[PDB]
Amino acid sequence: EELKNHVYKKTLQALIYPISCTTPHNFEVWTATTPTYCYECEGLLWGIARQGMRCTECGVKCHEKCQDLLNADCLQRAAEKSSKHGAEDRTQNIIMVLKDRMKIRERNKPEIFELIQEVFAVTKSAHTQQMKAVKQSVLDGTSKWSAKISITVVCAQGLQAKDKTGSSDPYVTVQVGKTKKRTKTIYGNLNPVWEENFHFECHNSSDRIKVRVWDEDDDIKSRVKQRFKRESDDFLGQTIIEVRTLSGEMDVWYNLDKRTDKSAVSGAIRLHISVEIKGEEKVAPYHVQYTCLHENLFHFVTDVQNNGVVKIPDAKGDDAWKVYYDETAQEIVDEFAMRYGVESIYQAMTHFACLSSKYMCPGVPAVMSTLLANINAYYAHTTASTNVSASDRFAASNFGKERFVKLLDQLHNSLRIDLSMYRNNFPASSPERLQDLKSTVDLLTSITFFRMKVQELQSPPRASQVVKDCVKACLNSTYEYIFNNCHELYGREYQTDPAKKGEVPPEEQGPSIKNLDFWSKLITLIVSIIEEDKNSYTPCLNQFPQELNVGKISAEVMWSLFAQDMKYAMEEHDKHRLCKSADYMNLHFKVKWLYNEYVAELPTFKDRVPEYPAWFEPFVIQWLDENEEVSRDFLHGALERDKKDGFQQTSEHALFSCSVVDVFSQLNQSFEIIKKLECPDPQIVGHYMRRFAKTISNVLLQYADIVSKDFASYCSKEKEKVPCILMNNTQQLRVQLEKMFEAMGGKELDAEASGTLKELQVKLNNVLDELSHVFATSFQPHIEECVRQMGDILSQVKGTGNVPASACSSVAQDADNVLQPIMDLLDSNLTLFAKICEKTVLKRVLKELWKLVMNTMERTIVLPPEFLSKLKDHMVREEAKSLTPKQCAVVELALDTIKQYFHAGGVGLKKTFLEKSPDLQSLRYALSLYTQATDLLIKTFVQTQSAQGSGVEDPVGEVSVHVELFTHPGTGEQKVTVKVVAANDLKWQTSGIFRPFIEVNIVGPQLSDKKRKFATKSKNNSWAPKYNESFQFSLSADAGPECYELQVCVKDYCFAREDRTVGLAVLQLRELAQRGSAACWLPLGRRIHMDDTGLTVLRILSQRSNDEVAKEFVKLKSDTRSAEEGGAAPAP
Question: Exposed, middle or buried: residue 944 (CB in 10 Å: 0-12, 13-18, 19+)?
Fold first, then answer.
């Protein structure tokens, strides 16, 4: 309180006689009427050469250059001068002008003295009496003011350089009126420390302490300059402290001022000044008094007048930060400050300290930010001509550097705290609180900038980061809040039934294992918060657009917190599985959406494959399973409907039945769900796809199987359409499966899923082939019956150039008659199938039917097994009747017609398949044999019967031959020398005289003109008869040795009886074509061993029963061992 009361008396004294209505000095040019020293610089005013200015009113005398340094009040100076010259009437007249000025002041502005009175809580009476007392204290002039002054010159900082060295030798002169003293000199230092105390007696508060800093030039140039100018010691700067601005024990940095235009000046001087004023002992410094005034006035204005509200003054321009109050309150502090030397920056740092307590109050952070940007700009920028850091210039603050640093730190912390609950503390529902939030951050920036610029701090906590942390802290607390209040918030903000808006349990305004609804609701609240941050707070907090986006930070933190929680929750749900598959899928869609809407695009998570699908995968897999069962049970339903409906084709162009459509619909529904998940993890997708491909495979094979199992039962004659439809179903599976394979990404599908479906497609292709075969097979008995009827008709056609006109009916008409049984079948069925079968189904059916027809015709018509019996075999002495040229024709034409039928003008099988058909080629081959020439048949026999030259089985002896093929050295024909050496092991211990001889026969083409047979002599009673007899066949010239074979026959010579065949051996002359000559022991057989073509050629040749070559060939091949004396039938 003791300071409060004194500050009140001083403030009344200040404002009763304010500086703003001090009288100006009326300076006449004056020639000094006595040897005079300038009241400001103490230079000799004398004569015309050292004229000064004399103020008429105050009789202060100064140089012209000094008249403006005289801030001394003209009226007080006048009262003093008048006193020091003994002019008492003038003194009293000035005391009367001083009284009238104080009466004017009270009359004009009583509200000042009233506001002082209220700010200091003084009574109107004690105010009026103190007012009378301070009026007298001003009218004491300075005749009744005196002081002792103790001036410790502490230091200067940042002085100018004036020496040849680029430094200075600073010393200080302190002058107080009549007395001049000097510090010792500090050499070479721009930041000198003196710490030197002078004592002075001051009889006049309008004296001025002239503290002049000088460079001590003792040199010749100084001794020269001394003649012309009174300040030889090259002037470094001054401070001119008005003695009215002294109070108690002061400790003050004074910036140094320019005395003259040639003065370069920089830096400050710290002066510790104790002043012992008469009637004002032990008073506080005017800085401390001003602080006390400003604090009381602030607490009065804010708390007492405005109930706590900080009334921001209407103030504009670069001096707005110097306006703290309304006019009256402003004039109080300004007149106090101006009268008592309190610099504007001190006033500001003080008011900033006041505002720092009320920083929560509306608009204050803007004012404070502005004020601090000015305080910043002051210390940071002012005068680059200084050689001192902003931090050191700020260490010369009379507010105290430390104090302001601490003040800013406390404030910065208070701002950090409030920003750590920014949503609550600055609700979006108040734009003004959003603007205070904005200005709270702008103040935090201004503080950080002040730390960076004024304090020159190397690493201040970066404002953007500090705020980002605050935002994180708030977001955490927000997250907690919503995470504790979820149902209330959601109920209120979104729920369309009011009965659901209320207080659902804390465990459901928080997580539940029984239901996901908390999470759904939490997501919508997270969205609401992220949107509020995006929409309200991000525009609000745009100060660091490249470093702070509140919507991004909100999304990141909220998703992070949510994601950790959700991940634990999904893990927990994965254990319990109390909610349904569908619910987790819906949650998955929501989380997917949330993520993809707000999170996917944040750099932090565009940088990743999203992890949330891994939470849901177990649930999607469970769903895929459930879906498989549902699919397989649906399938049996779908099939049972279709089966009961007898498999109607869906329509006359949808050649498949309905169950296909049902099933693929079910599959497609199932697939589309998965596909809509769009799971961003390709391995989880591969897993889903593998899982699902199995589903597909299982279902579709089970379809194919159910069909395949019943298929044969439908292949009966009344339901021909149903097999076609089932084949079309099957094929429609293949088609829809290719669609589905492609819909599953085709080439972009996972390798095992793709493999599975390619497998499935090949299996299904094969099912269709089997079904096509099973179908074609139900026609086989009819095709056989038909082809037997075609055979019954063709038997009536023979070699008809010598037969009646119903069978010498044209080759065409006989072909048509022959075909009629099968064309009744074919035309109807192939035209029906061509309609009701899909084109893939039709082609497969047709191949299976074509083969079946060709083979049936080959077997039943061209090579009927009874033609073994009727001229291959022994059964009937008939000529069999060959396929006659006319019946070879007719058949070849029936076949071209069948081929045209199966071609169906391109609707059936390609002409190319039909022509290349091995079935047709085989049929043509057998046919070609029936007309072929005797020699060509015989050549064919030798070339085909290759196995008649690789070991007789069950031999009846053997023959040693030596054989020399001569590509006859005399002709280039071939001749065959055959030395019959011996026989051995003849199984012929006979019922008589055995008389073996060896017939040798050559066989092959073109032998009609040639000796086909030789024989050895006979040998009596000899199972090992030697012969040593050499024969010489001629071959043709044309046919090579490979067209020929020797046939070696042992016979028992039997006059009266018949010469019994003992045995037979074949030697292929192809071998001899390499060997040139061969010794060989031919094993003897009972009959020659044959293939189908030997036996076919033989039954053909036997029909040529007038051709002598054929007769002898047939006879020769049809020779077998007359069984007896050693056995009947051989092995091949």
Answer: middle
Closest by Cα among 235, 236, 232, 237 to 222: 232
Side-chain-side CA neighbours of 960 within 13 Å: the count stands at 11
CA separation (Å) from 585 to 522, 523, 548, 578? 17, 15, 35, 14
From 241, 345, 351, 235, select the one nearest 293 (Cα to Cα): 351
Task: Confirm or deny that 163 is annotated as ligand binding.
Answer: yes
> What is the C-alpha to C-alpha distance for residues 1025 and 984, in angstroms, rounded to an integer?
7
H and E: helices and strands count for the chain = 36, 21
d(C-alpha 683, C-alpha 813), whole Å: 71
Cα first-last separation, the chain: 144
Token pair of 300, please?
């009065």
**685: closest CA among 633, 629, 617?**
617
- Overall size of the chain counted in residues: 1132
> What are the DSSP calls for 845-885, one per residue?
HHHHHHHHHHHHHIIIIIS-THHIIIIISSS--S------H
CA 665 from centre of chain: 32
To the question of whether residue 750 is assigned a binding role by annotation, the answer is no
Q: Is 724 annotated as a binding residue?
A: no
Q: Is 870:781 a contact under the CB 8 Å cutoff?
A: no
10 Å CB burial of residue 273 (0-12, 13-18, 19+) is buried
Give the integer Cα–Cα distance in Å for 1103 and 872.
9
Strand partners, 996: 1052
Is 62 marked within a binding site? Answer: no
Secondary structure in 3-state letters for 1092-1128: HHHHHHHHHHHHCCCCHHHHHHHHHHCCCCCCCCCCC
Q: What was the resolution (in A) of this experimentally determined structure?
A: 10.0
Q: What are the residue ranges spanned by the domains of the chain?
A: 2-139, 147-277, 471-608, 617-774, 780-931, 936-1117
Gap between the Cα atoms of 901 and 713, Å rounded? 28
CATH number at 2-139? 3.30.60.20
- Whole-number Å distance between alpha carbons of 987 and 1060: 12
User: How far is residue 733's CA from residue 152's CA, in Å, rounded to a whole number?
Assistant: 109
Please name the residues in contact with 34: beta carbons below 8 A apart, sequence gap of 6 or more.
none
Instruction: Give the method used.
Output: cryo-EM
Cα–Cα distance for residue pair 434/454, rounded to 1 Å: 29
CATH number of 147-277: 2.40.30.20, 1.10.287.130, 1.10.10.10, 2.60.40.150? 2.60.40.150
For residue 74, say whether it is annotated as part of any ligand binding site: yes
Q: How far apart are CA 42 and CA 59, in angstroms?
A: 15
Nearest-angstrom CA–CA distance, 477 and 85: 79
Residue 217 is assigned to a ligand binding site: yes
Under 8 Å CB-to-CB from 1118, ≥6 apart: which residues?
Answer: 1098
3 state SS of 1035: coil
Q: How far apart are CA 1077 and CA 725, in angstroms?
A: 69
Is-same-fold flag (147-277; 936-1117)? yes
| Local structure of 122: helix, strand or coil | coil
Using CA atoms, how far apart are residues 462 and 548, in angstroms rounded to an integer? 12
For helices 110-119 and 327-339, the axis angle rounded to 10 degrees is 80
234 annotated to a ligand binding site:
yes
d(CA 409, CA 325): 26
Q: Which CATH architecture has domain 617-774?
A: Orthogonal Bundle (1.10)
Pick the CATH number of 936-1117 from 3.40.50.10310, 2.60.40.150, 3.40.50.300, 3.30.390.30: 2.60.40.150
Tell whether residue 474 is among the known ligand binding residues.
no
Q: For residues 169 and 182, is the Cβ–Cβ distance under 8 A? A: no
DSSP of 595-645: HHHHTTTSHHHHTS--SHHHHHHHHHHHHHHHHHHHHHHHHHHHHHHHHHT
Helical spans, DSSP H, in 645-681: 658-677
Contact 88, 78 (CB under 8 A): no
For domain 780-931, give the CATH number: 1.20.58.1100
